[PDB]
Amino acid sequence: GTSNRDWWPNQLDLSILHRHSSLSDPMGKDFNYAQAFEKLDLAAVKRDLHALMTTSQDWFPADFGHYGGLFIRMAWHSAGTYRTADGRGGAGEGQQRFAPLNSWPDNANLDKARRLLWPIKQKYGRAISWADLLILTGNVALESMGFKTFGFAGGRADTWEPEDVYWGSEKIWLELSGGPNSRYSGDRQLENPLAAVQMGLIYVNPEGPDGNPDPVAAARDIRDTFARMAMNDEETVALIAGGHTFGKTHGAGPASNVGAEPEAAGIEAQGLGWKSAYRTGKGADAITSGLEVTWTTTPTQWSHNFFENLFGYEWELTKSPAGAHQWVAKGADAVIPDAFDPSKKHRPTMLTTDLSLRFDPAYEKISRRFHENPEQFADAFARAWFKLTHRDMGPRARYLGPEVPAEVLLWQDPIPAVDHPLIDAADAAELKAKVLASGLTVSQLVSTAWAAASTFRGSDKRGGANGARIRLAPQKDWEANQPEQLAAVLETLEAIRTAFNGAQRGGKQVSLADLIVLAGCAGVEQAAKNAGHAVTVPFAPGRADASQEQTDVESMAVLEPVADGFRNYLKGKYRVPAEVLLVDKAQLLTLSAPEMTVLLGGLRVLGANVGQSRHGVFTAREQALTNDFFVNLLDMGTEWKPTAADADVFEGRDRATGELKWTGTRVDLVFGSHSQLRALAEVYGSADAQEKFVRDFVAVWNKVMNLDRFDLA
Amino acid sequence: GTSNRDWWPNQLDLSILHRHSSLSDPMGKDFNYAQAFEKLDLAAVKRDLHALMTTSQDWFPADFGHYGGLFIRMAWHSAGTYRTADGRGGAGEGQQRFAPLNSWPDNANLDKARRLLWPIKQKYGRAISWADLLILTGNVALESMGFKTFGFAGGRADTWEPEDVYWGSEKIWLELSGGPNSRYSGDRQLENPLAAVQMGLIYVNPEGPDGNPDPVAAARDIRDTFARMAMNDEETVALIAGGHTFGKTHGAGPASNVGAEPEAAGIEAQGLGWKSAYRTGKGADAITSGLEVTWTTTPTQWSHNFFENLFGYEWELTKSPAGAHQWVAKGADAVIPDAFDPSKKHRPTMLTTDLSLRFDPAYEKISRRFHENPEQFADAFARAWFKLTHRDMGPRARYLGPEVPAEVLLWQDPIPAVDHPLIDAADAAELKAKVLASGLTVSQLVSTAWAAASTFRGSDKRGGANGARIRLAPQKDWEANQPEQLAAVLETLEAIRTAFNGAQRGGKQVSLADLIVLAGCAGVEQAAKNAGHAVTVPFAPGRADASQEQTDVESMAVLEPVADGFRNYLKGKYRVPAEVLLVDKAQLLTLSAPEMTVLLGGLRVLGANVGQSRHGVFTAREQALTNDFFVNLLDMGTEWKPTAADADVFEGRDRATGELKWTGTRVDLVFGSHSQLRALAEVYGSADAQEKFVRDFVAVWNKVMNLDRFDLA
Ligand code: HEM
Numbered sequence A, B: 001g002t003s004n005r006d007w008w009p010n011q012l013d014l015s016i017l018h019r020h021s022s023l024s025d026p027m028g029k030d031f032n033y034a035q036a037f038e039k040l041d042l043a044a045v046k047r048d049l050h051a052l053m054t055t056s057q058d059w060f061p062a063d064f065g066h067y068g069g070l071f072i073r074m075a076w077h078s079a080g081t082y083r084t085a086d087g088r089g090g091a092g093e094g095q096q097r098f099a100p101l102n103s104w105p106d107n108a109n110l111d112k113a114r115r116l117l118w119p120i121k122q123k124y125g126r127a128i129s130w131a132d133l134l135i136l137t138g139n140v141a142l143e144s145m146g147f148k149t150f151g152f153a154g155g156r157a158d159t160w161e162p163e164d165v166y167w168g169s170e171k172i173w174l175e176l177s178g179g180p181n182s183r184y185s186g187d188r189q190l191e192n193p194l195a196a197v198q199m200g201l202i203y204v205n206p207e208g209p210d211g212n213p214d215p216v217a218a219a220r221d222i223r224d225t226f227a228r229m230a231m232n233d234e235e236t237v238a239l240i241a242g243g244h245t246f247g248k249t250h251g252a253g254p255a256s257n258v259g260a261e262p263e264a265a266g267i268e269a270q271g272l273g274w275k276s277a278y279r280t281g282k283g284a285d286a287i288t289s290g291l292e293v294t295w296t297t298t299p300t301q302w303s304h305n306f307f308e309n310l311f312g313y314e315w316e317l318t319k320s321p322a323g324a325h326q327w328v329a330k331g332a333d334a335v336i337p338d339a340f341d342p343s344k345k346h347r348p349t350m351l352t353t354d355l356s357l358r359f360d361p362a363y364e365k366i367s368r369r370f371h372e373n374p375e376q377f378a379d380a381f382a383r384a385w386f387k388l389t390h391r392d393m394g395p396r397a398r399y400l401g402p403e404v405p406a407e408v409l410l411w412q413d414p415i416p417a418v419d420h421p422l423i424d425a426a427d428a429a430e431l432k433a434k435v436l437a438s439g440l441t442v443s444q445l446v447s448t449a450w451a452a453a454s455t456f457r458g459s460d461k462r463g464g465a466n467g468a469r470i471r472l473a474p475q476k477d478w479e480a481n482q483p484e485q486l487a488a489v490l491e492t493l494e495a496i497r498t499a500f501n502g503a504q505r506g507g508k509q510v511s512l513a514d515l516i517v518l519a520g521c522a523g524v525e526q527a528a529k530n531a532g533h534a535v536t537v538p539f540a541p542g543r544a545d546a547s548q549e550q551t552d553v554e555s556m557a558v559l560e561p562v563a564d565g566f567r568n569y570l571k572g573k574y575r576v577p578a579e580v581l582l583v584d585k586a587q588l589l590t591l592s593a594p595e596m597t598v599l600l601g602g603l604r605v606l607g608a609n610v611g612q613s614r615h616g617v618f619t620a621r622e623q624a625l626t627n628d629f630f631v632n633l634l635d636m637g638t639e640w641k642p643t644a645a646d647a648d649v650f651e652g653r654d655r656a657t658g659e660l661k662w663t664g665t666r667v668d669l670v671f672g673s674h675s676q677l678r679a680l681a682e683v684y685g686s687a688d689a690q691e692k693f694v695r696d697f698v699a700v701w702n703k704v705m706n707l708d709r710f711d712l713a
């Protein structure tokens, strides 16, 4: 069946904005996951998980009689798809159970791990999500094997269809670098927003870069990919040595024995894949990665034996039974036990990427410290494992259950507690009038609140107006945010705040974060009034102000908007056309196509563009909230052509006279070009639409203001 | 960006079930188009349309100073994509403004037509849909040019994204037959459900079959394609001669002058396409089809000149200025006016497909009769134009506005008016008790009501339980409906009905159509009772019984289910795997994936399978409403393999012993294999899900029972 994508493969794709509708969701419209989870007997779930660890199923037998190593891998792959660039991937939506991640090569045999958990999922039903269960199981595996975890939060709601993510452009699984779709260029520069070295890997190649078993070069890939998943050197070493304290790899025979991944397998495989024709096809015969390495002398107990081996032997390049590069300890005794035969022992073995931890000089220092001081190792690993498995869950207000750690961590972008009475409706009316009386303009008010709120992204639930981080480094100096105009607006708002707070009794006060949003609300009200329409814009107080010392400046970098079509802004020249970047931003803000359309059309006539650009400002009454953008965009009396100097800027001239009426960008003109978006523009450009336009604009404005308000959830 | 479709191109696609969500719809969730339309000043819209006919725009000038011909083409193409096989296409969703149809080669320059209508659409806004406007404009073009139409109904709601339609498998526009994706095999047999001869045409090739200018062979294509759009010989001749009484074709120079279709054009074209480099690119220089034919001596007035010319000359094959085959009248004077130059006249010309109306023996007889009796021609064309433009609108209860014809037509599948008091709640309880006391089983009751209601399709809103056509030819004879079991159940229901109706006072009576649905509901209640649950099933009376004479047997054949996964039925072997056919049927029934899943699992345990097959009947308590199907389907203690005899039937055996537990088809097991469907099955197979399964089942059952109930809508 030939499709629109076939005929027009470069057309913009809006269907990413209409995922996760009530149609595809089996739960009722009123289902609340948090309310279900908060009644779960978590202690009972954990006891069930603890028993499951040592209850081997014959269809996929447990190594050493213990599934713990398998479940740790499962939970570290669930979390391990995360990219800091866009916040996409991670464990937060349980996406490992859908395409494509259910069938990535690096997730081979995790299908079996997830099937082992079905009887527990079934028992507890909607009270525990698959997304939560995947991570909980990893925690319980660690606990069962004598490791003390840092804690656990529930609250990851299940999703019901694949997330639309750019995983790269290669058309072959695990394709080595330098092909026609290479994810690398220059001196090994990995294209953003990717965080893995080959299509279908979690981070790096365990043999070494594109298969080359050099631990030093492997270390460069490890550091780069882990940084791109928000982990530094100490966290990276702790995680890799911590993980490889447990269990084993599987490569008993050649990879050509292994059949179709789950999405390609026959209907009779019932959701499983990688069926193997080698010997029994499982257990002692298992093939997963093709490597056959067992790290420690007690693979089912926490120890400091990984670093004892790493530093206590010299290592020789060798091959698994599948033909993959791996390393074996020169001259060592057989001290490592066998997974199934108590009469058999083995010499210590290592991956190329394990030896990276000793042969990269910076790693070596940390590894040595962890070797000599295993208590430091345990604490680092516990903290890293928590961060790994929670880094995409958003603010601490989303954390549920009885095991949530009390310590507040810097990477959580923490918001202080509110410890005073909030402002009421009369107060908010008073403060809006004061803001408007100050002389701040519609454009200043709307711009500033947009700048503060529009850093939110639903992918990892970072960003938003809560915290008032727009006043801090680095937000206050981002080019998009117009640092000098921003400073003058914040100065004026801070004086209003000081005067209001100074007059109160009984502890009542307003945060700057709330006042920034409320001021933006006053700007939108005033613009409606400028148009001849009285409206109230909803506002919910309760935000608090975070300090500079509670703000990690390096971590905040990835939230900078380098493309924001809502402010007609592009920081530099990109490969991806600007309209595709606009749809990407709308996806992160959680906007539908109709929401994106309304919002952009209003922002244009309110004066939100960076630098007061005239591009797309299709009105002769700026700072009035009207549907002018749409009426003027759709007027056939105007003809559009790209400029000589710049093919991405367009002039709109009267078709009869030739007079210049307007200019615009690709972001502006796409609403008059794309067949689906133009249909939406038509609704708001109709003669009957002014009331609808205003109401829908206020709604989507308020939605954006509240994106990070999980305290009200 | 590589996608799941790239990696696994033959995977099932569930996103066709979750199209048209509230997310993509710009209107509020309460918007009711009918209520908006009923307040439209239709007379005002028509005056504006009359004005527009002769208001030529410079950017695409009007032939002969009158856009009427262009708009009639526009309206006939809007309606002309309809296929009787699945009810898909037609005018009823305004889909000509979206991909792919906005950019089909046969729809070249209709973009110009639709843009000419924007000012009217804008003026009247949501009170007239594009879908209604395209057809009304065709009606007004006809009226402006002196032809009296049979009438017009509003009520086609606009849609906001492309419909998922199989238009064929060719990967080249207009590809001639016999290629690697040929829509033809054997003795020119067109694959169902297609209704056109080449990809991107409405019906047939105007030069002749695969470009061969033989009018006799072209006639075979015309008959076959028009039959597949529900039109017989009389209606087909009326429509083609009626249409081609107006306007002209356009092929003033070579097709290589014409640039990208609208979906491929540059952003600056603002939704238009086919920009031409030939001379002025438009008007006298226009190129659309490549043919250059003007049929009558008065192209902007209704006349009887089409058949005068067709019969009054002999015809000579020749070529247009673009090189396409067409026909010119031997020895004729230049009597046909020129569209732009009053000093120029032209000889009469015809398409290959026009000569088909004279050289096919069956058409010649009709054409002659129309020539000799022009008033018969006019009436037939008026009636056929109404049928063409309304054939996909469904029951007459959906028809809005003040121009709706009073005459009831056979192709509207008419249902008599109800002229008596309906049964009340007390009556319905009485009739349910009598049905249960008769001996009829859960399985019989559920099967029969399913059979009656599940003929509905949302594509053209035909079918459903209203009319009790299940008791008539041909429904009573269809294999899926189990003719002999069906006869015994209807006999019993008719005796209950006779006795209840004979006891009533006033005129109160129950229809068989209502009783069949009510009895189905009682079966569902009894099944819930068998399972230990107290359940009420909603029921709405008001269906009526249609007669055999109000039921066209040939038209009814396209509604026969040859595949119904919901009854585990496949009438023979098909190219498309059965699960794809299941999702296709769920789309026609307007079901989401969660609705499809719930429904299918319940029907299996209630005994709805054709022939009492055990396939998918995964319960030991048949005729009890439980979630057994899911709990057993997801049990890892069972292993599944295709049988020796039949690769589409599967045996489910105990994994430990090897004992046979169950058998199933692809339709059954896809719920345990497809990663999204399995996630749905898991919700319903959990330990907390029994009451959720029952309540969700009753909701979807009631939905299906009410799909055709536009009298209550
Ligand atoms: C450079 C980073 C990493 C590389 C290249 C790497 C590579 C691999 C490979 C190739 C396997 C064998 C899969 C099989 O054949 O069954 C594996 C196993 C495993 N990995 Fe890692 N890994 C890395 C980091 C991590 C981290 C961060 C953790 C958790 C904190 C982890 C935990 C494990 C565990 C527990 C297993 C054993 C699974 C079992 O017993 O069945 N790995 N690793």
Ligand code: HEM
Residues within 6 Å of the ligand: B063, B068, B069, B070, B071, B072, B073, B076, B203, B204, B205, B206, B222, B239, B240, B242, B243, B244, B246, B247, B248, B249, B250, B251, B287, B288, B289, B290, B291, B353
């Ligand atoms: C065998 C069926 C038919 C074929 C092959 C056919 C073919 C065509 C072609 C090729 C054109 C010229 C397009 C252009 O170059 O601008 C055309 C024009 C048109 N057709 Fe037909 N047509 C058919 C049936 C119909 C029907 C059923 C109607 C309406 C009842 C219709 C009404 C028109 C009109 C009004 C035009 C003139 C357009 C104008 O003046 O701009 N045709 N047709």
Ligand code: NA
Residues within 6 Å of the ligand: A087, A088, A089, A090, A092, A392, A459, A460
């Ligand atoms: Na994420």
Ligand code: NA
Residues within 6 Å of the ligand: B087, B088, B089, B090, B092, B392, B459, B460
């Ligand atoms: Na249709």
